[model samples]
Target: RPDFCLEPPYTGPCKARIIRYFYNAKAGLAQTFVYGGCRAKRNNFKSAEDAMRTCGGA
Candidate 1:
């Protein structure tokens, strides 16, 4: 698996994390970055249904 502190300007001891995806009310799609041992935003969703339930996917 790919490792090491990459994606400069935000480098650190990298670790895997949840990748939340949210649906946009007026765009292609919305999503969160690789969590990597950090807190997530309020809008970050657990799943497609979860987002649409809270943010209206369609």
Candidate 2:
């Protein structure tokens, strides 16, 4: 299963059904941003299809 993006005290947007796709290399987690926020980096996937292509999954 996927881990919660951030634990708590989050000071940004993206929540509940408004979360954008992001990954955590440390473990299993997905963070959220304002879709086009600059705080995000690589490994950002749009959807499962996009993630599979970007992540090279089956």
- Give me candidate 1's TM-score against the actual structure: 0.47
lDDT for each candidate structure: 0.45, 0.43
lDDT of 2 by residue, 1-58 (tens): 2233223213245333434565543444444434544444455556645543444322
TM-score, one value per model: 0.47, 0.36
Give candidates' CA RMSD values in order: 10.5, 7.6
The list of candidate 1 runs beyond 4 A from truth reads 1-15, 28-33
Highest lDDT against the true fold, candidate: 1
Candidate 1 residue-wise lDDT, 1-58, digit = tens = 1121111112124576656554454453444445454444455556767655655533
Runs off by more than 4 Å, candidate 2: 1-18, 23-36
